[PDB]
Amino acid sequence: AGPLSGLRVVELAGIGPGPHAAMILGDLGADVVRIDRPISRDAMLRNRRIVTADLKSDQGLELALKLIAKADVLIEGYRPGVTERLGLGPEECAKVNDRLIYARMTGWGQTGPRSQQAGHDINYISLNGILHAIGRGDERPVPPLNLVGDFGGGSMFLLVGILAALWERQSSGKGQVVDAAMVDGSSVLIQMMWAMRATGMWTDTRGANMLDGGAPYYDTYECADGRYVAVGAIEPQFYAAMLAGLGLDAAELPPQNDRARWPELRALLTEAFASHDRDHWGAVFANSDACVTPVLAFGEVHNEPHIIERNTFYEANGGWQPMPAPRFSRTASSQPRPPAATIDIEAVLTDWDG
Amino acid sequence: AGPLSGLRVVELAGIGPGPHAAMILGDLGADVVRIDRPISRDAMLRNRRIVTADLKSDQGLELALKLIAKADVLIEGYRPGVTERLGLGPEECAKVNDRLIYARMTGWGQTGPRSQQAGHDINYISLNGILHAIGRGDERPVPPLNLVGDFGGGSMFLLVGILAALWERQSSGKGQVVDAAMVDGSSVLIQMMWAMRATGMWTDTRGANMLDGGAPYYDTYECADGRYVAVGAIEPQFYAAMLAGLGLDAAELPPQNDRARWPELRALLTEAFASHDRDHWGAVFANSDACVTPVLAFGEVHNEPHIIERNTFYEANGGWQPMPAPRFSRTASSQPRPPAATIDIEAVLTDWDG
């Protein structure tokens, strides 16, 4: 039902960014066929058809290629060379389908000294200054889950690459290869900090900047109940609204942007926030522009009115899952279809005509 | 030169996600025209033409609409209702160009109880369980800079919405509205943790999971020089390669996934890593699959061989900036054009035929 209805995607079963990319394509209405090794409880495998094949066997290769001959996009996330050795590399795929967008999802990219090296998110963002910038300044860096390498700088760039290549295809008639490396995507993801560093607006000192926790107006605060609020009152008029809700006199406080006095400012803000519960502040600044919000655990999200009203989540069997994003006014996306039983690869070939 | 060469984008100047989205379109070859209020050192504003109009004025509105009439995409990132009041809302734009992809970039979305409220990244990820999941367990949550709401769950979803809607326009001949809300995108960005929570594979206890710092094999360690390495050795063979490099006898350590003895495991690993400087480990895990990498500060990135050889960065005027991502084999993106002087809006309208 979404805008990608009609798009055919072959996904070679992998882990992390590749399956996430394929999910979003399916989310938006694509026809996604996932080939695995010979009913999943993994909600990420929503919006698929699962088929199986041994790609090291002559029959599996032949069946895979027939599928690929009829697809728009191929997603693979193995080490570079792996698809080549199977006979499913870009040059073999070209011979049967030169309209194909061949999307290669890696951490380190297709070439370079590290291209054959195992790794995970935390490694890809360790090499490009990202990790070093995350966490409190008095302690070692903390990983921002696998949100920045695997997804924000990984699958999301694979998706952009795929969709941009589909635009180009309109006039060239041809596909090509998209090399989406997490080490690259994540760097463009953090381009604002590269831009800020060049102008004296960001330092390499962890935890001492405007957006990393260093600013008392841009951080979390612990409340009376041991729960937290988030404060993001960057603009002076938002900051002023924040001080108001807390019952603090601005004249009695250091100026907002006097970094010399930030520890003094933070102590006053700490004392304020610590005097009531999280839900008290939630109520104080419910409709304000104070940029103060309650910090909800996953298990609490379902109770928040803005989350409910907008149907950001849906109940699948066993728990809430996020609905497709972003939203489309005319070709809206469906509620995702749960994972289903594996189906016969030949049946999909009939459906597609391979 | 990139795959988006030919695409026409009108960007209504704003902050954070919108300008980052426009940048990536520009990066990939789009013809992006930015309308600001009446030459930048913001490297984010690379790959543009900048023009000036007072949109509150009769003549300003008229010129903007003439530009929009010739564009493929419009990006705006103001509060919902703002463009409506200006007379550049979706209903007004449709009258002059129904092929327009109208891309609306917000935190809270177009509708809902919070939709008119101020906020910034830290607020958007505070409402949907993300923030609460970031940081050490013995402390309040830390913001993962503005990487998760503004960009990974923000501009990146706007971009997917834009390019998806363009694909759809191939066959419907028409555009539509993309409502990209950071509270939604970030939720889809963290779908893996929603999937895991449902199967008992992720807990709401901060700092106590596989990918958040709780696992001794997926975290940073401080070295003899006070600098850091990242360890990402999730798979047993990589973990084994890690211990081997450290000269620790496995027989003598707690099992990798015995959570009850994780603190004992961490302490042994801490002692090991602290015995030499970062560059030593740097060297020990050379081309190994041990998933151990050095944690480079921004200012060190330019010295790293894998970074150099792949040209992940380029020297603009004054500092390193990331090259376009992802990479395309046939229609490669150009090195970004630096920000240039504001130009005459009519010269753009002549160029485009408006």
Ligand SMILES: CCCCCCCCCCCC[C@H](C)C(=O)SCCNC(=O)CCNC(=O)[C@H](O)C(C)(C)COP(=O)(O)OP(=O)(O)OC[C@H]1O[C@@H](n2cnc3c(N)ncnc32)[C@H](O)[C@@H]1OP(=O)(O)O
């Ligand atoms: C409710 C549950 C939710 C689910 C939760 C899941 C669990 C959570 C875990 C989180 C995972 C996310 C983690 C944190 C990340 O950070 S992801 C980043 C990992 N890196 C990458 O993806 C970069 C690209 N990939 C790689 O570098 C490597 O694939 C790897 C991930 C390091 C693993 O290395 P390794 O296991 O040696 O695999 P590869 O070298 O790729 O070779 C794969 C071999 O398998 C074969 N193969 C594949 N498909 C088939 C098939 N259908 N039939 C037959 N064979 C198949 C290939 O031929 C290849 O074999 P060969 O070519 O070596 O002989």
Ligand SMILES: CCCCCCCCCCCC[C@H](C)C(=O)SCCNC(=O)CCNC(=O)[C@H](O)C(C)(C)COP(=O)(O)OP(=O)(O)OC[C@H]1O[C@@H](n2cnc3c(N)ncnc32)[C@H](O)[C@@H]1OP(=O)(O)O
């Ligand atoms: C090297 C330099 C680097 C540069 C770095 C920049 C500095 C770093 C700062 C950190 C930025 C990143 C932070 C962490 C973020 O999270 S950004 C995300 C902020 N949130 C959003 O974007 C969500 C959607 N937007 C909004 O909610 C709001 O726009 C906002 C950000 C809260 C700002 O609120 P506010 O100032 O009241 O603006 P709005 O309500 O949107 O109204 C805008 C008014 O301006 C007017 N306007 C606009 N363009 C023109 C024009 N060309 N000519 C004449 N007028 C113009 C509009 O008409 C509107 O007026 P009105 O309709 O309100 O009367």
